[PDB]
Design a protein around this nucleic acid. Structure first.
Lengths: 45, 155, 123, 82, 80, 129, 205
RNA sequence: UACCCGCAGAAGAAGCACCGGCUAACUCCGUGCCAGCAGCCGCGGUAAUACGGAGGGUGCAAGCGUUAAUCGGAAUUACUGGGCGUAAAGCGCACGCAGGCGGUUUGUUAAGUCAGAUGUGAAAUCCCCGGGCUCAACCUGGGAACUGCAUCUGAUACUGG
RNA sequence: UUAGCUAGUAGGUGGGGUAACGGCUCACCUAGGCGACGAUCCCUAGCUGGUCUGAGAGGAUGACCAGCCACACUGGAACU
């Protein structure tokens, strides 16, 4: 509905400015096995 | 013959070079519905193996308690580690109004009518210790006749 | 904890602040959409969540979540707002009420319609 | 002045009247000095339905209190039958 | 047959008038502890007689000034 | 220093009963002897004696059953901090029968039970179990 | 204010006969009584402690026809009274008219006996009572009134009462079509498969 | 008007929330860290019992849910009923005024304390046993209660003088 | 994270005033009175029987019904 970005007033190039917003930002995933993969609970039990 | 609840089942763990060795504790009480109660606490790598080790550990390790018409003699306290535990005898048709682990212990002990309350921690293992601690020190009118050398209208 | 000490200074029942103080103990309030916008949540969640800033009848100007899939709020839509926390999403203590004043309800619900102000479909 | 009168009570369309030595300025259901008996006009007529205290009414008429229309009639009627 | 308190005499600078502390042992409502709670009173003494420190006894009569409604029945102990 | 000597007697019992002593002594008083008597009539102690004219010495003899104490537990109730009086309907009963309160009444020190028959209340000294 | 649905979905969820169809036809021909209702019935659950308390209350409710707001009120009353609060609660459900009808055997089921009662076919002590929750006392007569002796329903129902067990606490006199609620039933007189301690535990959480 | 009698025909009269755990109730299809859900933990990145729809089920039912507010649970301000070596918590150490507490014995006083009696503590409300509305809510008769305060007469173990 | 407040102020004598006691008011005289058992000052609030919650002790509350208080466009005053 308009994204409210954390960059202030954009001055020149807006795409390069949003690239450096939390909007974009690497999304990494939890492994389900090996090396960061321990659950206490697990989704149901 | 005798009744046998399963209270709780944790998974516990132990770290090694490899990673984690998981293992299961179970916790059971047994009792003759009539003032005897053991609790046992098993461990094993499978869950039905562990309940079984507990049911065995409970049968041996099992103590007497003088009830009165299916309720307590007098209002008892009890404590083990974090768990404090107050129980109070009740009029007929209360039922066992009482917490988690408490409720198991009292049912198979053959208490029918109590007002319990667990303060402190409510760690299942330390509550069934605190509850049994309570019930075993609790003492009949016939025992105290003997102590003091009476047998009065206090009887 | 000494009796005598409590006579001279008795126990303070520590008095609790409300989580929804813009309401002022009204169960809803009305206000006007200043401004409407998406924003990203806290970790670990990933999303764009729809919220409006909103000036209430008692002056307070506060931000407000908008539920459901899709909407048509904007500058100067008059809306009703209720309490209701949202976690993945910082500083947002009130929900907008859907299907009351200038938020129409959600298009094409069937389950849980009353939470989104949707009339029973004639069938 | 002091009076003796019926205060209304009971549900709607099923009154019930306490009998109350009030000062006359006070409102019907408000402040009374004594209560003295009662009066049920919907009574079953196998089971009481009126009981005055004639010993304490006659005391208050002594000290110089009025009576209503109705409480007069109820005194006439509870000295006929009893 | 008169209700009559006792006390002791914590001022007497005023003319024909004294001030008289009454002690009493109250149970605290919550905590159960019995407490000294004091009740001061301005009192009419005719003849300026009663000294400071003196034990005394007093009764409730009509109002005599702004403050006083209490008048001095008799002295008990004194001069101490 | 030494500001509740009844609690002192009660503690000297309790601590002797824990240490499996046959007997304990303390400084006597009137009121200690009164209590000591109630405690004996009710069968928590075997017997007390008093010796001395000038500095008298109460010697209680403690009591055991199955190689185990008789006095299961023994609270003070009325302290110097906090005096605890009770009217006759409000008297406590201790283990719902089986222990005893100890009450100072205007007719001397006695049990909770024996103040209900006599129809009194007063200062509650101590529970026993 | 009344369960209008399938009566054997209820009987499968308890795993029990709730007497909700009379016994012209016996039970195991009609439904599948062992299997639980709907799609995922043949799979077992480990039923929790709240569960078994809930499951037992809803057994009792569904026998007697009573809804929760009203049942909760019977429970308050039953505790207010002096007595075992389980035994009192079952007195107050065997007091109900629609039941007492059925136990004398003018209804085939409690749902029939409730239609009698509602449709002004029943008097109590001469007066027409037409509300199901009326609490019958000791030494009241209940009796059928004079349109409703000539119904087929009531005659065929009295056949089915001879094959069920006899209640002690009623004296029925079935040629006239009346009978006398004599005394309150004791716990021994009622079915012992109903645990009552579970219901009382439930509300006192 | 209550209440009573007659007529017609199953006719004119069922929804709301939920189904990952806490918490009673589970499977398909769509979707692919998007859309969304969410009270707290958290669910969603192509096999989602957690989103949306469907089918089934659980719970309430002329109501059912959301929000707000109070108490509860919370022994989480602890009188009943908590603590303070390391978890939050012993003033840096002393002296000491008001204050709190005070060894043992006899006498006396009777303030605290206890017992009894009278007066008052409005009626309604609450609780008990009844009665009246077809039942119930609702109304009502009698009681108990109002733990209090004052006065009077006793008791004197404990506290005080 | 409000510690000092009060000069008709506190008491007396005499006049006046009130249905009535009274610094209620006035003239003279004395120099008191209140306060860490919280005076004074600021904020909030009609009080009670009750109501809700609680196993209870407690906490929260004072809508309807009933008792008492206060106000009647804001401020001031009398008259009958």
């Amino acid at each position: 509905s308009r994204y409210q970005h954390t960059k202030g007033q954009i001055k020149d190039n807006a795409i390069e400015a949003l690239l450096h917003d939390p909007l974009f930002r690497q999304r990494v995933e939890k492994n389900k096995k090996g090396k960061g993969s321990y659950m206490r609970k697990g989704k149901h039990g | 013959e005798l009744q046998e609840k399963l209270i709780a089942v944790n998974r516990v763990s132990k770290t090694v070079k490899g990673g984690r060795i998981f293992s299961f504790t179970a916790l059971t009480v047994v009792g003759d519905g009539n003032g005897r109660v053991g609790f046992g606490y098993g461990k094993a790598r499978e869950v039905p193996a562990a309940i079984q080790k507990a049911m065995e550990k409970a049968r041996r390790n099992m103590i007497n308690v003088a009830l009165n018409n299916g309720t307590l003699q007098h209002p008892v306290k009890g404590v083990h580690t974090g768990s404090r535990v107050f129980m109070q005898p009740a009029s007929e048709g209360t039922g066992i109004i009482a917490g988690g682990a408490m409720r198991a212990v009292l049912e198979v002990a053959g208490v029918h009518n109590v007002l319990a309350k667990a303060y402190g921690s409510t760690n299942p293992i330390n509550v069934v210790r605190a509850t049994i601690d309570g019930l075993e020190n609790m003492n009949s009118p016939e025992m105290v006749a003997a102590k003091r050398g009476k047998s009065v209208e206090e009887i | 904890a000494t009796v005598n000490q409590l006579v001279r200074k008795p126990r303070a029942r520590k008095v609790a602040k409300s989580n929804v103080p813009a309401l002022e103990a009204c169960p809803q309030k009305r206000g006007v959409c200043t401004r409407v916008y998406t924003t990203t949540p806290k970790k670990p969640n990933s999303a764009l969540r729809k919220v409006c800033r909103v000036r209430l009848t008692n002056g307070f100007e506060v931000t407000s979540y908008i539920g459901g899939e899709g909407h048509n709020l904007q500058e100067h839509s008059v809306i009703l707002i209720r309490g209701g926390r949202v976690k993945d999403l910082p500083g947002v203590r009130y929900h907008t009420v859907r299907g009351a004043l200038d938020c129409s309800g959600v298009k094409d619900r069937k389950q849980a319609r009353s939470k989104y102000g949707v009339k029973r479909p004639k069938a | 002045m002091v009076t003796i009168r019926l205060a209304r009570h009971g549900a709607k369309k099923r009154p019930f009247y306490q009998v109350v030595v009030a000062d006359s300025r006070n409102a019907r259901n408000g402040r009374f000095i004594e209560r003295v008996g009662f009066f049920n006009p919907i009574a079953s007529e196998k089971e009481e339905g009126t009981r005055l205290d004639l010993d304490r009414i006659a005391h208050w008429v002594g000290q110089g209190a009025t009576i209503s229309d109705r409480v007069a009639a109820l005194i006439k009627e509870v000295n006929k039958a009893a | 047959k008169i209700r009559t308190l006792q006390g002791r005499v914590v001022s007497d600078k005023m003319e024909k008038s004294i001030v008289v502390a009454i002690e009493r042992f109250v149970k605290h409502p919550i905590y159960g502890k019995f407490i000294k709670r004091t009740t001061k009173l301005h009192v009419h003494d005719e003849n300026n007689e009663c000294g400071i420190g003196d034990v005394v006894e007093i009764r409730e009569c009509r109002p005599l000034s702004k403050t006083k409604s209490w008048t001095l029945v008799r002295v008990v102990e004194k001069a101490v | 220093s030494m500001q509740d000597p009844i609690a002192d007697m009660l503690t000297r019992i309790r601590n002797g009963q824990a240490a499996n002593k046959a007997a304990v002594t303390m400084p006597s008083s009137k009121l200690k002897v009164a209590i000591a008597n109630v405690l004996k009539e009710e069968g928590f102690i075997e017997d007390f004696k008093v010796e001395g004219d000038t500095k008298p010495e109460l010697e209680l003899t403690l009591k055991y059953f199955q190689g185990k104490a008789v006095v299961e537990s023994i609270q003070r109730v009325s302290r110097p901090g906090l005096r605890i009086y009770k009217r006759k309907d409000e008297l406590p009963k201790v283990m719902a029968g089986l222990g005893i309160a100890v009450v100072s009444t205007s007719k001397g020190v006695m049990t909770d039970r024996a103040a209900r028959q006599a129809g009194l209340g007063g200062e509650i000294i101590c529970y026993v179990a | 204010a009344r369960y209008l649905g399938p009566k054997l979905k209820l009987s499968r969820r308890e795993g029990t006969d709730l007497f909700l169809k009379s016994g012209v036809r016996a039970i195991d021909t009609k439904c599948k009584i062992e299997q639980a209702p709907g799609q995922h019935g043949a799979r077992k659950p480990r039923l929790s402690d709240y569960g078994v308390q809930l499951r037992e209350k809803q057994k009792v409710r569904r026998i007697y026809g009573v809804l929760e707001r009203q049942f909760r009120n019977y429970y308050k009353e039953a505790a207010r009274l002096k007595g075992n609060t389980g035994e009192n609660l079952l007195a107050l459900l065997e007091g109900r008219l629609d039941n007492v009808v059925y136990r004398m055997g003018f209804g085939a089921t409690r749902a029939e006996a409730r239609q009698l009662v509602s449709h002004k076919a029943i008097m109590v002590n001469g007066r027409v009572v037409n509300i199901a929750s009326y609490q019958v006392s000791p030494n009241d007569v209940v009796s059928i009134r004079e349109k409703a002796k000539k119904q087929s329903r009531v005659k065929a129902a009295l056949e089915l009462a001879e094959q069920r067990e006899k209640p002690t606490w009623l004296e029925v006199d079935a040629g006239k079509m009346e009978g006398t609620f004599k005394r309150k039933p004791e716990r021994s007189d009622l079915s012992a498969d109903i645990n009552e301690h579970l219901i009382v535990e439930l509300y006192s959480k």
